[PDB]
Design a protein around this motif. Structure first.
Motif, PDB file in Angstrom:
ATOM      1  N   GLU A  76       0.830  -1.204   0.000  1.00 34.53           N
ATOM      2  CA  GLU A  76       0.000   0.000   0.000  1.00 34.53           C
ATOM      3  C   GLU A  76       0.863   1.252   0.000  1.00 34.53           C
ATOM      4  O   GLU A  76       0.499   2.268  -0.603  1.00 34.53           O
ATOM      5  CB  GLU A  76      -0.940   0.019   1.205  1.00 34.53           C
ATOM      6  N   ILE A  77       2.001   1.207   0.692  1.00 33.26           N
ATOM      7  CA  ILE A  77       2.819   2.406   0.831  1.00 33.26           C
ATOM      8  C   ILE A  77       3.503   2.736  -0.493  1.00 33.26           C
ATOM      9  O   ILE A  77       3.664   3.908  -0.853  1.00 33.26           O
ATOM     10  CB  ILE A  77       3.825   2.243   1.988  1.00 33.26           C
ATOM     11  N   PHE A  78       3.887   1.705  -1.255  1.00 34.09           N
ATOM     12  CA  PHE A  78       4.631   1.932  -2.489  1.00 34.09           C
ATOM     13  C   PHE A  78       3.717   2.134  -3.689  1.00 34.09           C
ATOM     14  O   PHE A  78       4.069   2.882  -4.606  1.00 34.09           O
ATOM     15  CB  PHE A  78       5.582   0.766  -2.759  1.00 34.09           C
ATOM     16  N   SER A  79       2.554   1.478  -3.704  1.00 33.05           N
ATOM     17  CA  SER A  79       1.627   1.642  -4.820  1.00 33.05           C
ATOM     18  C   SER A  79       1.177   3.092  -4.941  1.00 33.05           C
ATOM     19  O   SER A  79       1.131   3.653  -6.042  1.00 33.05           O
ATOM     20  CB  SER A  79       0.424   0.717  -4.641  1.00 33.05           C
ATOM     21  N   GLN A  80       0.844   3.718  -3.811  1.00 34.39           N
ATOM     22  CA  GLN A  80       0.520   5.136  -3.812  1.00 34.39           C
ATOM     23  C   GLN A  80       1.757   6.012  -3.949  1.00 34.39           C
ATOM     24  O   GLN A  80       1.639   7.168  -4.369  1.00 34.39           O
ATOM     25  CB  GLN A  80      -0.243   5.500  -2.538  1.00 34.39           C
ATOM     26  N   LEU A  81       2.936   5.492  -3.600  1.00 29.11           N
ATOM     27  CA  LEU A  81       4.168   6.212  -3.899  1.00 29.11           C
ATOM     28  C   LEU A  81       4.409   6.280  -5.400  1.00 29.11           C
ATOM     29  O   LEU A  81       4.909   7.292  -5.903  1.00 29.11           O
ATOM     30  CB  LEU A  81       5.349   5.551  -3.189  1.00 29.11           C
ATOM     31  N   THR A  82       4.060   5.217  -6.127  1.00 34.18           N
ATOM     32  CA  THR A  82       4.099   5.277  -7.584  1.00 34.18           C
ATOM     33  C   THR A  82       3.122   6.317  -8.115  1.00 34.18           C
ATOM     34  O   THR A  82       3.394   6.966  -9.131  1.00 34.18           O
ATOM     35  CB  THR A  82       3.796   3.904  -8.184  1.00 34.18           C
TER      36      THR A  82
END
Lengths: 83, 71, 49, 51
Positions: A70-76
């Protein structure tokens, strides 16, 4: 829990070992545990089953493993906003 | 130039420096010499090491090169 | 080898160019490394061949 | 490798002399190899592959 530890945990599970999570992490095999040992102080509980041959996935560790996604998908999302 | 066509393994640089450039996928010596000091200080884990390891090789950062990469 | 007549001077002899490289082969190897054209004796023999 | 001696020595054979480090002598050997695998000293040694 520093955000540098954020990217050392996600590679650990898919690489099935701490030392095997180093080739795609542009880091040696020693540093992968240096963040995890701090995790057992701020958060204060185990993530993986530490064994000689491999590591057993824990139910709590996968829950964070999805939390790291979740943290990286929205970081993308911030990344493609710049793109 | 006989150094441009070689990868980054011909420097015998420190392990801290030997791992930092792999983050940006540095493949050629020309690739690392094109980029200057004003943007290579951003990467964590050099400023007191790269100049002296490269001076003895007859090379220095900041040179401008064309037709790169020639493949 | 067979012998044949020579224009040559009294101190000169007509060698076949093919036998000279065979006879002076160690000399070629020795002076080739001095010239620096062959790093190793194997390369010397290869380029002689 | 027993170069300029009468025999070679194994991992423990040299370990009993300097340090009992088993894998660390091995990685010293690996470091030596990668030092000798570099295209900075191997240029002339590579020519000795066909013999």
């Amino acid at each position: 829990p520093p955000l540098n530890a954020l990217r050392v945990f996600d590679a650990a599970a898919r690489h099935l070992s701490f030392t095997r999570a180093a080739e795609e992490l542009f880091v040696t095999q020693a540093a992968v545990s240096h963040q995890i040992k701090s995790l057992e102080d701020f958060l204060g509980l185990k993530l993986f089953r530490r064994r000689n041959r491999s590591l057993l996935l824990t139910e709590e560790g996968q829950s964070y493993f999805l939390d790291i996604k979740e943290i990286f998908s929205q970081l993308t999302e911030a990344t493609r906003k710049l793109q | 130039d006989p150094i441009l066509l070689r990868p980054v393994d011909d420097l015998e640089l420190t392990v801290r420096s030997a791992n930092c450039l792999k983050a940006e996928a540095i493949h050629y010596i020309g690739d690392l010499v094109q980029r200057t000091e004003v943007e290579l200080l951003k990467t964590p884990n050099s400023l007191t090491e790269i100049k002296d390891v490269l001076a003895s090789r007859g090379l220095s950062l900041g040179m401008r090169l064309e037709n790169w990469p020639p493949a | 080898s067979v012998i044949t007549v020579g224009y040559l001077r009294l101190h000169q002899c007509g060698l076949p160019k093919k036998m000279a490289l065979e006879l002076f082969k160690p000399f070629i190897y020795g002076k080739l490394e001095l010239r620096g054209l062959a790093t190793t004796i194997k390369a010397a023999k290869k380029m002689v061949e | 490798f027993g170069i300029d001696m009468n025999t070679d020595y194994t991992l423990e054979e040299v370990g009993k002399q300097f340090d009992v480090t088993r894998e660390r002598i091995r990685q010293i050997e690996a470091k030596a190899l990668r030092k000798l695998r570099h295209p900075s000293r191997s240029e002339v040694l590579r020519s000795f592959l066909d013999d």
